[PDB]
Each structure stands twice: as structure tokens, then as C-alpha cells.
């Protein structure tokens with residue numbers, strides 16, 4: 001597990017480095033801000049219907065009466081530009097605040113704990129998470145547990161022994177064709193069927209798919225020996 | 226997701242008029258901003274659908290024989306007889322839900338058939354594998370045992386299910402059967418998606434009808450105002466008309482951006498619900514249905530998703 | 538030899554899970570995978 | 579018909595491509611409009 005973790009991080013470094021848009025989210029944020037700034041600045045060069053885009057010329061060249069209406073048009077256009085910029089910045093800030101709330105939630109529930117929410121922190125059974133600072137953002141290294149080598153098995157809901165149904169206390173009844181074993185759900189670790197890891201819940205008649213098998217009794221050997 | 230729209234300034238603000246082209250260019254790069262914003266919204270809608278429905282990495286198929294311990298998924302599983310392989314509930318949802326001035330409606334990247342294919346893959350994975358398909362390789366497991374897992378996940382011993390398998394199967398079948406009736410009987414059952422469609426249609430209609438607005442001009446139509454007046458007197462009126470229509474476009478884009486943020490919040494919630502209830506069993510209270518959550522089944526719907534939260 | 542092509546999107550590889558009334562698949566090994574998630578703040 | 583032309587039907591003065599329509603006008607009616615108050619169909623003055 002330690003080697004797999006080390007190799008995983010070593011691959012994370014290369015995958016971040018090589019991919020053209022690994023940090024595309026933060027790059028898009030920066031680009032959106034830069035383009036908003038650039039369009040706001042370039043809006044000073046727009047006439048807005050006035051006969052001049054440079055304003056030191058419209059006032060001096062024109063008479064104060066007409067210069068007043070020309071400056072009115074220019075101020076209306078530029079204040080429209082400012083209001084549009086502020087509204088777009090408010091919408092973008094709401095989007096960024098939603099993302100920052102999600103980042104705070106992910107920090108709290110995966111860096112500061114182990115989350116059982118599926119796919120919230122990485123694809124797989126979440127194990128850990130490591131925050132990493134990034135320009136105007138955060139990068140989480142979601143360490144997850146992915147089962148790898150599945151294998152077919154014959155399973156049964158219960159085990160009929162001594163005329164009473166037996167259910168796995170924690171795990172699954174499986175058989176390798178001939179012998180019946182109880183196994184934890186996420187990792188093939190066959191165990192001999194025993195009264196310790198099985199609990200009796202009635203008779204064999206009710207259950208559909210119950211298989212007839214023997215359940216080992218730990219106490220009998222000590223009584224015999 | 227919402228309607229995937231796009232706008233052409235040079236045709237919306239004026240049509241056949243070419244003088245408006247020159248008059249608009251001097252206004253500046255407002256229309257570049259508008260096109261970029263609308264393209265961002267469209268790509269966002271495509272991403273919304275992809276994030277909600279493409280949770281699965283492999284298209285799964287249910288076995289040809291569909292005995293799942295007595296549970297009946299015929300209402301949620303695809304219907305091969307009809308052309309579009311949509312389940313009866315999906316068909317009911319699709320049936321219930323019900324401009325060339327530069328306004329164009331871009332088609333979604335994922336067709337309704339492919340969204341139904343994603344939904345069917347998720348359903349098949351959930352049925353034949355449980356939550357395992359969402360956290361690694363899909364692992365086969367009998368449904369009477371998967372539901373015993375789901376009982377263990379709500380603090381009820383799996384004993385309870387195996388002693389009551391037929392009763393639980395009948396209750397689930399009856400609930401699924403009543404879902405179709407409850408959806409069909411109430412016209413406002415799909416009110417959320419219907420409201421989304423109505424909001425998009427109202428936005429398009431008000432944007433189109435804003436062309437007839439005078440904006441304090443002698444003539445709203447462009448040919449009359451330009452031809453009747455001399456170019457000096459006509460330019461101020463045309464500038465007023467262009468300012469009015471450009472404010473209309475800015476208002477439409479801002480409203481679509483706010484609505485896109487709302488729909489993106491809803492699509493993030495839908496992706497979260499799919500991940501945590503279709504691909505797993507969630508312990509969060511009231512997140513997926515009122516009661517101790519057992520399962521959830523995605524169903525495609527026009528510009529949305531419908532979850533059948535099976536609870537205990 | 539090389540040119541732009543258009544095609545219908547392939548949603549993914551078809552994987553019919555070998556569901557059966559008594560067949561289960563318990564994994565015998567794991568994989569500690571690290572995933573990277575980037576979030577604007 | 580089926581070619582984008584500028585059409586002048588008794589001063590309507592619209593542009594578009596003309597196709598035959600299955601819709602039936604009332605005898606007094608001359609042109610049709612859609613919901614958005616845009617000219618959708620026109621009755622030919624020469625014919626009916």
C-alpha cells in the first residue's frame with residue numbers, strides 16, 4: 001500500500017505537469033478576470049455615438065452646450081460599461097463563492113475527516129485527501145481505495161445448519177465450488193463458517209435461496225478436549 | 226440544463242440594414258462579450274448534462290432474463306418494442322413536458338437517446354452490481370443480497386429482508402406502479418422542468434417582441450426611419466433604437482446568466498444526488514427521499530432528471 | 538491518410554454484467570489511486 | 579417559390595423564401611401572422 005501511494009503521487013506530479021489544461025479551472029478564472037478588465041479598459045476607446053472617443057478633445061473643440069450632451073452620452077456609455085462590469089463580477093463572484101463553499105466543504109469532510117459520500121472526494125472508497133495551494137484556488141489529492149482483481153463466486157443469502165438459518169454477521173457467504181466460506185465484502189478473505197461470524201435468525205423454510213451447509217462450532221473441540 | 230441558445234447581434238439589432246453594421250462597430254465590443262457569454266452558457270449546459278448523466282464509464286446491460294428476486298423494474302428498464310428505448314416512466318415524463326431574428330437554438334451534444342442510454346447504463350449497473358460500479362469495477366451481486374446490503378445500511382438486519390422478501394418485493398412493485406399514476410394524474414408533477422422551459426420561452430418571446438419597441442423613436446422598423454429621414458437626423462434615431470435593442474440583449478444575457486447559475490446549482494445537486502444515491506446509499510437525512518434511504522433510480526426527462534428515491 | 542472525420546459519439550464500452558441469481562464477484566486485490574481535484578477559491 | 583427573394587405583396591415589403599402552404603385563410607384575410615407578430619404566410623394577390 002505504501003508503494004502504491006508513493007507511485008500514485010509520483011504519477012500525480014507528471015499528470016499535472018504534462019496535461020495542457022490540468023489547471024484549466026483556475027486558468028479560466030484568471031482569463032475571465034483579465035478579459036473583463038481588458039474589455040472595461042478598451043471601452044474607453046468607444047464613441048458611444050459621440051463624435052469623439054478621446055474626451056480632452058470633445059470638450060475643448062465643442063461649445064459647452066453641445067459638449068454637455070456629448071459628455072452626457074460618454075458618461076452614460078461608460079457608466080453602462082461599469083454597471084455591466086460590476087454585474088458580471090457579481091455573477092462571477094457568486095460562482096466563485098459557490099466553488100469556495102464547495103472547497104471548504106471538501107476540506108472539512110475529506111482533509112479533516114473521511115467522507116462516506118460517494119464520488120464527493122475521488123472515484124472510489126475515499127481514504128484521505130491532501131490540500132495543496134494553487135493560484136486563486138485549492139488542489140485536493142483525493143487518496144481513494146479502488147478494488148482491482150474481482151473473481152466470480154457462488155453466493156447464498158443464508159446457510160441452513162441444524163435446521164436453523166444462519167446469516168453472515170459481517171460479510172458474504174461464498175463458495176469456491178465445493179466448500180462454503182464467509183468473506184468480507186470488499187476483499188476476498190475467505191473464513192471458515194462459524195457461529196462467531198454468523199447469527200441465527202429462525203428456520204430454513206422461510207429464506208429463498210438458502211443452501212444446506214455445516215457451521216463450525218468453536219466450543220465443541222474444548223468440550224471434547 | 227436549459228435551452229442552448231445563441232444570438233447574432235448584426236442580425237438582431239438590425240436585419241437587412243447595413244448602416245447599423247457601421248453604427249454598431251463604433252459602439253465597441255459589447256457583442257463579443259454577448260457571444261462569449263452565450264457560448265459559455267451553452268458549453269455549461271453541455272457540461273451540466275455530461276456531469277449529471279455520464280457518471281458511469283461503461284455502458285451496462287441488464288441480463289436477457291430479468292428475474293431479480295421478485296422485484297419488477299419493467300417500468301424503469303428500457304422498452305425494446307418502441308423505437309426510442311425509453312422506459313414507460315421516461316415516456317410519460319417526455320410526453321407530459323410540452324424565431325429567425327438572429328436567435329438560434331443550438332442542439333444539445335447528448336441526444337435524448339444517448340441520455341436514455343446513460344440512464345439505462347446506470348440502471349443496469351445499479352441492478353446487477355449495486356454501488357460497486359460507481360467506486361471501481363462493477364461487481365455482480367444478486368438483487369435480494371444487494372437489498373440486504375441496503376437494509377444493513379439503515380440499521381435493519383438483513384435477517385428482516387430474507388424473512389420478508391416477497392412482501393418487500395410486492396411493496397416495491399406497487400410503489401413503482403403508483404409512481405406512473407402519480408406522475409400522470411398531476412399536471413404540475415413536472416412543474417420544475419415545465420417552468421424552466423416556460424422561462425426560456427418567455428425570455429425568447431420578450432427579446433423578440435422588444436424589436437417592436439420604439440425606444441423613443443419615430444419608427445421602430447429600420448427601413449422607414451432611415452429612408453424617410455435624412456442621414457443626419459436618421460442617425461440619432463437609429464442610435465437610440467440600437468441602444469434600446471442592445472440594452473435588451475444585455476438584459477437577456479444577464480437574465481440567462483443568472484438562470485444558468487440557478488440551473489448549474491440544480492445540475493450540481495443532480496450530479497451529487499446521482500453520485501450519492503444511484504451510485505451509493507446515502508446516510509444524509511432527507512437528501513434522497515423521506516425515510517431511511519435504500520436506493521434511487523435515474524430517469525431521463527426533458528432538460529432534467531427524475532430520481533425514484535426508494536426509501537424504508 | 539489523415540483527415541477530419543465526423544462520427545456518432547461512443548458513450549463507452551458495452552459491459553454486460555454477468556448477473557445471476559447466485560453469482561457474486563468479490564475483489565481479491567485493491568489499488569490505492571490518488572485523484573487530483575482543482576477548485577477555484 | 580423556393581428561392582430567397584424580396585417580395586412586395588400589396589406593400590407588405592418583406593424578405594424571405596416563398597413556399598406553398600397548407601394553411602387555409604378566411605376569404606377576407608390577406609396575410610397571416612404567428613405568435614411573435616411576424617409575417618408567417620401571405621396570400622398571393624394575383625391568384626387566391
Ligand SMILES: *[C@@H]1O[C@H](CO)[C@@H](O)[C@H](O)[C@H]1NC(C)=O
Pocket residue numbers: 150151152555562
Ligand atoms: C464471471 O463469469 C462470466 C461468465 O460470462 C464472465 O463473463 C465474467 O468475466 C466472470 N468474472 C470474472 C471476474 O472472471
Ligand SMILES: *[C@@H]1O[C@H](CO)[C@@H](O)[C@H](O)[C@H]1NC(C)=O
Pocket residue numbers: 176177178179
Ligand atoms: C476450496 O478451498 C478449500 C480450502 O480449504 C480447498 O481445500 C479446496 O480444494 C478448494 N476447492 C476448489 C475447487 O478450489
Ligand SMILES: *[C@@H]1O[C@H](CO)[C@@H](O)[C@H](O)[C@H]1NC(C)=O
Pocket residue numbers: 160210211212
Ligand atoms: C437441507 O436438508 C434438507 C433435509 O432433507 C433437504 O431437504 C434440503 O434439500 C437441504 N438443503 C438443500 C439446499 O438442498
Ligand SMILES: *[C@@H]1O[C@H](CO)[C@@H](O)[C@H](O)[C@H]1NC(C)=O
Pocket residue numbers: 291292297298299402
Ligand atoms: C412487471 O409488471 C408488469 C405490469 O406492470 C407485468 O406485465 C410484468 O409481467 C411484470 N414483470 C414480472 C417479471 O412479473
Ligand SMILES: *[C@@H]1O[C@H](CO)[C@@H](O)[C@H](O)[C@H]1NC(C)=O
Pocket residue numbers: 209290292557558559
Ligand atoms: C436463478 O436462475 C434462473 C434465472 O436466472 C432460475 O433458475 C431462477 O430464477 C434462479 N435459480 C435458482 C435460484 O436456483
Ligand SMILES: *[C@@H]1O[C@H](CO)[C@@H](O)[C@H](O)[C@H]1NC(C)=O
Pocket residue numbers: 148149565566567568
Ligand atoms: C495486487 O496488485 C499489486 C499491484 O497493483 C501487485 O503488485 C500485487 O501482487 C497484487 N496482489 C495480488 C494478491 O494479486
Ligand SMILES: *[C@@H]1O[C@H](CO)[C@@H](O)[C@H](O)[C@H]1NC(C)=O
Pocket residue numbers: 624625626
Ligand atoms: C388574371 O387576369 C388576366 C387578365 O384578364 C386573366 O386572363 C387571368 O385569367 C387572370 N388570372 C387569375 C388567376 O385571376
